[PDB]
Design an enzyme around this catalytic site. Structure first.
Site, PDB file in Angstrom:
ATOM      1  N   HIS A  70       0.800  -1.254   0.000  1.00 11.55           N
ATOM      2  CA  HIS A  70       0.000   0.000   0.000  1.00 11.55           C
ATOM      3  C   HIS A  70       0.813   1.274   0.000  1.00 11.55           C
ATOM      4  O   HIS A  70       0.233   2.350   0.067  1.00 11.55           O
ATOM      5  CB  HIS A  70      -0.996   0.013   1.172  1.00 11.55           C
ATOM      6  N   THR A 200      -2.790   6.456   9.920  1.00 14.90           N
ATOM      7  CA  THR A 200      -3.764   6.545   8.838  1.00 14.90           C
ATOM      8  C   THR A 200      -4.019   5.251   8.074  1.00 14.90           C
ATOM      9  O   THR A 200      -4.659   5.266   7.016  1.00 14.90           O
ATOM     10  CB  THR A 200      -3.401   7.670   7.850  1.00 14.90           C
TER      11      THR A 200
HETATM   12  N1  6LH Z   1       2.531   0.387   9.434  1.00 19.08           N
HETATM   13  C1  6LH Z   1       2.147   1.192  10.601  1.00 19.08           C
HETATM   14  C2  6LH Z   1       1.861   2.598  10.135  1.00 19.08           C
HETATM   15  C3  6LH Z   1       2.852   3.573  10.197  1.00 19.08           C
HETATM   16  C4  6LH Z   1       2.584   4.870   9.762  1.00 19.08           C
HETATM   17  C5  6LH Z   1       1.325   5.221   9.249  1.00 19.08           C
HETATM   18  S1  6LH Z   1       0.990   6.740   8.770  1.00 19.08           S
HETATM   19  N2  6LH Z   1       0.382   6.763   7.342  1.00 19.08           N
HETATM   20  O1  6LH Z   1       2.207   7.560   8.902  1.00 19.08           O
HETATM   21  O2  6LH Z   1       0.018   7.315   9.710  1.00 19.08           O
HETATM   22  C6  6LH Z   1       0.356   4.225   9.182  1.00 19.08           C
HETATM   23  C7  6LH Z   1       0.626   2.935   9.631  1.00 19.08           C
HETATM   24 ZN    ZN Z   2       1.528   7.520   5.990  1.00 17.47          ZN
END
Ligand code: 6LH
Ligand code: ZN
Length: 259
Positions: A70, A200
């Site tokens: 992703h 997020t």
């Molecule tokens: N894989 C954990 C993780 C780390 C960081 C984010 S984010 N988009 O920076 O909020 C989301 C999930």
């Molecule tokens: Zn992120």
């Protein structure tokens, strides 16, 4: 969990079922979520939000970068850290990743005054805790990316790597580069917004202290397009990786501050 979480574009571009953002589980349906819109003129100045100190950000490395399904993610492995920035402790760098589209007016997760930028880069750090999990366990630095005609030479190692990791679970090694190569000039990082929120992607844990810098990274249109052109969400390579963006969440009773 009737199916795996996905972004809206994945559900729209494939017949295989998946859970779109509005249906995400874990903590995703709680009320201190991210990302948000920031009304810049309503964020109050807090004098205690001083400059950041970056450590390890100037050092040239050959980073490992991977397609996690992703996003594209550089593994930072504590080889860098931050303090200052009005933060309660130093934080150790874990990973850098991005969110993007293929149109210049969308791609960012946060918006400034209702404007989305072409990409948003997140550098994810973890709190050096004392003996007394918390609301600010994770510090994410967010940089907005504005599309233009300027070739960002600093980004070229990353952009060249993308060709090698089109499918999820593929990794490669970038050419020699520093974290500062990816960022605006350090003197321009004095202006930033600050609030408390979540990760997020699921499980969307509410343990992030957010920083969104006012100054965008300038990237050439085609360096941006290289992300959606070279990467896929799936091993079948049926959905080009783009619009990996969580929709805007409500600020609710939270307050956004700025330096
Ligand atoms: N894989 C954990 C993780 C780390 C960081 C984010 S984010 N988009 O920076 O909020 C989301 C999930
Ligand atoms: Zn992120």
């Amino acid at each position: 969990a009737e199916s795996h979480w996905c972004y809206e574009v994945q559900a729209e571009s494939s017949n295989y079922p998946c859970l779109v953002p509005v249906k995400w589980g874990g903590n995703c349906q709680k009320d201190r979520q991210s990302p948000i819109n920031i009304v810049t003129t309503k964020a109050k100045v807090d004098k205690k939000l001083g400059r950041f100190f970056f450590s390890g950000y100037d050092k040239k490395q050959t980073w490992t970068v991977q397609n996690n399904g992703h996003s594209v993610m550089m593994l930072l492995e504590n080889k860098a850290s931050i303090s200052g920035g009005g933060l309660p402790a130093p934080y150790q760098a874990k990973q850098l990743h991005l969110h993007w589209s293929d149109l210049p007016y969308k791609g960012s997760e946060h918006s400034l005054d209702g404007e989305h930028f072409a990409m948003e880069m997140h550098i994810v750090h973890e709190k050096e805790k004392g003996t007394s999990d918390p609301e600010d366990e994770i510090a994410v630095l967010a940089f907005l990316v504005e599309a233009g005609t300027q070739v960002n030479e600093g980004f070229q190692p990353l952009v060249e790597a993308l060709s090698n990791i089109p499918k999820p679970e593929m990794s490669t090694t970038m050419a020699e580069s520093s974290l500062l190569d990816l960022l605006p000039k350090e003197e321009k990082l004095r202006h930033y917004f600050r609030y408390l929120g979540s990760l997020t992607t699921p499980t969307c844990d509410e343990k992030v202290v957010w920083t969104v810098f006012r100054e965008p990274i300038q990237l050439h249109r085609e360096q941006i397009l290289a992300f959606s052109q070279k990467l896929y969400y799936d091993k079948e390579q049926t959905v080009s990786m783009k619009d990996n963006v969580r929709p805007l969440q409500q600020l609710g009773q939270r307050t956004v501050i700025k330096s």
